[PDB]
Amino acid sequence: STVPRLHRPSLQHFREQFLVPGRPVILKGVADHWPCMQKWSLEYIQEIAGCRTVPVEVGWSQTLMTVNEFISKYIVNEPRDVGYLAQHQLFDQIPELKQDISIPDYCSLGDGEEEEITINAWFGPQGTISPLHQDPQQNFLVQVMGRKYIRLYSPQESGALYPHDTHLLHNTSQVDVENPDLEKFPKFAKAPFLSCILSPGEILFIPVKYWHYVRALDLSFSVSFWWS
Numbered sequence: 283s284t285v286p287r288l289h290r291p292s293l294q295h296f297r298e299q300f301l302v303p304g305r306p307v308i309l310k311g312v313a314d315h316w317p318c319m320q321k322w323s324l325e326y327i328q329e330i331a332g333c334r335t336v337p338v339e340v341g342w343s344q345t346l347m348t349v350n351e352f353i354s355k356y357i358v359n360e361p362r363d364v365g366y367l368a369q370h371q372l373f374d375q376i377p378e379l380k381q382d383i384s385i386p387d388y389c390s391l392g393d394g395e396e397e398e399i400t401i402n403a404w405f406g407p408q409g410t411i412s413p414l415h416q417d418p419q420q421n422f423l424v425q426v427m428g429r430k431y432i433r434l435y436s437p438q439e440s441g442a443l444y445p446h447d448t449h450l451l452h453n454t455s456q457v458d459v460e461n462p463d464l465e466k467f468p469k470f471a472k473a474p475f476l477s478c479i480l481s482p483g484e485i486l487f488i489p490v491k492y493w494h495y496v497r498a499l500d501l502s503f504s505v506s507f508w509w510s
């Protein structure tokens with residue numbers, strides 16, 4: 283089934299129908315006119331951030347390079363491998379970029395402090411994949427550039443997703459969502475899910491502990507807000 287799209291729902295409607303029961307939704311008309319949506323070209327990113335060091339996931343290895351090197355090696359030049367500037371607090375590192383985003387007003391429905399909201403950048407070429415995993419906070423995933431295919435499985439379905447047994451990976455499924463090994467993981471086939479293609483200006487609410495799998499369909503930039 284599809285994730286529902288709602289235009290600027292009230293705080294109360296969002297709280298009652300989505301946050302408290304733990305149901306995903308796409309919020310429209312919320313982030314669509316943030317400055318990032320028109321300002322963040324590759325060239326702008328190079329101008330503001332190009333000389334700064336970022337962590338880059340390659341493949342599986344973790345390396346460090348400048349933003350300029352990342353763009354040259356993994357985005358613009360026929361790249362040899364997939365590289366992803368994933369899960370990085372770029373906005374703490376480069377505070378000028380905070381001017382181009384906002385914290386969604388819905389985060390004020392949580393029990394946590396605004397100071398403790400973690401804002402991560404996710405910037406990479408077409409074809410980056412984040413395997414199916416769950417996170418311990420609520421998330422608003424804001425799509426700025428490009429589109430992502432997203433699959434969502436409820437925490438009720440965790441038995442059918444065969445989480446890894448190691449503590450480093452217990453929040454991650456052993457299954458490759460788009461090419462599952464049903465001989466090894468047969469319960470996966472019948473597990474229900476939601477999916478969407480998340481486009482620029484749209485926000486995906488991923489409830490706490492909802493399993494999510496993400497594949498970039500174009501050159502992509504997303505901003506996540508982890509909150510409670």
Ligand SMILES: O=C(O)CC[C@@H](O)C(=O)O
Nearest residue numbers: 404412421423496504506
């Ligand atoms: O966009 C991605 O590739 C994954 C993002 C996601 O896991 C998150 O927690 O925001």
Ligand SMILES: [Mn+2]
Nearest residue numbers: 415416417494
């Ligand atoms: Mn995540």
